[PDB]
Amino acid sequence: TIIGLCTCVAIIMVSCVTSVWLLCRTRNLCITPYKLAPNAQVPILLALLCC
Amino acid sequence: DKTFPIMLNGQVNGYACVVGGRVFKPLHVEGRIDNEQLAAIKLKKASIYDLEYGDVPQCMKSDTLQYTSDKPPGFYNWHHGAVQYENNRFTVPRGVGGKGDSGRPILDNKGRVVAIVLGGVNEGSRTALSVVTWNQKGVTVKDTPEGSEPW
Amino acid sequence: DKTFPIMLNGQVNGYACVVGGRVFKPLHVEGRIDNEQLAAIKLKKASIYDLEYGDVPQCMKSDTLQYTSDKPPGFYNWHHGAVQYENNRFTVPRGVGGKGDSGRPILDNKGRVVAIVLGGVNEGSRTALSVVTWNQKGVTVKDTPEGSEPW
Amino acid sequence: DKTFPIMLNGQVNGYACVVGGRVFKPLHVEGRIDNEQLAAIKLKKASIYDLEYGDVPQCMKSDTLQYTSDKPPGFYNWHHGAVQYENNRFTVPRGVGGKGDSGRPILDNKGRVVAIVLGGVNEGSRTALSVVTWNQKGVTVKDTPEGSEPW
Amino acid sequence: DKTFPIMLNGQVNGYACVVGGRVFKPLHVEGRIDNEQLAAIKLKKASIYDLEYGDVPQCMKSDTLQYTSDKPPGFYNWHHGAVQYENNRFTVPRGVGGKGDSGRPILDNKGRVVAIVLGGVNEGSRTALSVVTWNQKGVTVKDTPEGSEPW
Helix, strand or coil: CHHHHHHHHHHHHHHHHHHHHHHHHHHHHHHHHHHCCCCCCCCHHHHHHCC | CCEEEEECCCCEEEEEEEECCEEEEECCCCCEECCHHHHCCCCEEECCCCEEEEECCHHHHCCCEEECCCCCCEEEEECCEEEEEECCEEEEECCCCCCCCCCEEEECCCCEEEEEEEEEEECCCEEEEEEEEECCCCCEEEECCCCCEEC | CCEEEEECCCCEEEEEEEECCEEEEECCCCCEECCCCCCCCCCEEEHHHCEEEEECCCCCCCCCECECCCCCCEEEEECCEEEEEECCEEEEECCCCCCCCCCCEEECCCCCEEEEEEEEEECCCEEEEEEEEECCCCCEEEECCCCCEEC | CCEEEEECCCCEEEEEEEECCEEEEECCCCCEECCHHHHCCCCEEEHHHCEEEEECCHHHCCCCECECCCCCCEEEEECCEEEEEECCEEEEECCCCCCCCCCCEEECCCCCEEEEEEEEEECCCEEEEEEEEECCCCCEEEECCCCCEEC | CCEEEEECCCCEEEEEEEECCEEEEECCCCCEECCHHHHCCCCEEECCCCEEEEECCHHHCCCCECECCCCCCEEEEECCEEEEEECCEEEEECCCCCCCCCCCEEECCCCCEEEEEEEEEEECCEEEEEEEEECCCCCEEEECCCCCEEC
16 A cells, blocks of 8 residues: 555656646747747637647 | 847857847857847747747837838848848858858848848858748748758 | 946946045945956945945055045036035036936045035925035035935 | 967066967966967966966967077067177166066067066166076076076 | 869869879879879879879870979968978968868979878968978878868
């Protein structure tokens, strides 16, 4: 039980960090094209899917 | 001044530009910006465009370059002379541009910046420029013709 | 020169001066003196006067401003022109002074430093200045008007 | 430029010479070299010669003073005036030399470095200089009169 | 003609010359000699000096350049102009010669070949050349400045 719980917590942490890292990296890659272009349409849907 | 040289060991290793309140410099160019006001800005990385960006001091915001995406075919101006825009590609005569010229801006006849020169292709009689520009929707895009090398 | 502007991010936000062999800079002005010889000395705090001081380098001790405690009523000058000294107050016409003019010394008709300006108050006709001066006994005193603002 | 001054506190306290494609600077002269590229190279110590040396930058390899070991009786020159060589000794007129002249090379009628000056002695008629020169075998040899003061 | 260009794909990669009765060309030069009488000769690989050599055909024996080991300091001629030789070093002004110029001979005031150029080093305002020369006893040797790039 000790080994099982420790393995689950380690798996959860590694998975949550990877998930958040991938999602945050997605936002940076999705939004960066528009930060370098202040005069852009920036559709509202962009702020809903990539944020 | 609109263009600021970047010095590594006392030699110029590139140029930094300020457009619409934001400063851009080549990500692959190492060294300090030869400007006390710009050297104090902490810039964010944008690996998609091989450049770093950030905001400029309130004193400079009033005189930054104007962004534009209207890029009809024809000739454009840049630091070393004129630039030809054809087939959605920026090209210049052979011998115009080289190592250390990365980050220079390309402007239209209205003084608006259309692309940032990061590199190019050395051909037999002409050269093709690897630049960062904007599409018809105004979204930043990087154009890197096959064989482009950073300058 | 004898007055050395103090620069923080490549912009002047005050002025340092050398009086009687000592380098005086305002305490509320943060930044580095635009120099290499005077900027390498450690400065002591004088928070009761909102000033900092240090020893002038041996090669610079001779090239310093002289000061006097005798301040007869009349007109004095500084970087921006004439300064009126009456009713125990230093004052300049409205709008002549402002933020950034901190640490600038005031000179008499003989070229002697009489006060170091740290701030001021805008009155109905003239702006009173908050300065560090010496009383009739030559003791350093902080002469500030009511509601003075640091510059 | 082939001879660069050395500065410690902003004033010149000696010289660093580019002779033979190598930097020659006295050891008793502390400070940075006027040229930023000569100051950026690591130098070796030769205590037996009271001088410090190192290889010059790529661009300075050709732009360097040539040296000669042949110093017949006659006159030579440096920035303080003419230098007279007699009885195998470098003697300058009374009062010509002094503090800060160390490291300056003595040039012949062809512009070649004959010796590097390090100090001197006032003999009451003429001043003898402490120099680093080359013997009849072309080997570096230090020649200093007894009691010579490092300059 | 006593010098023959070497071309691989129609571009000049180097030059060959007839000195003392032998045909000389560098190892790093690829392509064929335009003269079929020389190109058909089997050349020996003298990797010690980066030179290929062979025997001049009897029909070409008259097209032979005289050589000498007497190379005093001074100026020498070659296809790009004058060449300065001093301190056992061959030097040309920067920009005089480059890739493709290896194998050219250097001639004295009597038209005798004194060296064959293999490459060079750019030393500021001057470029040092890697050359194959004969010592004071006439023995073939290879002189290579550090960092020399084959031409």
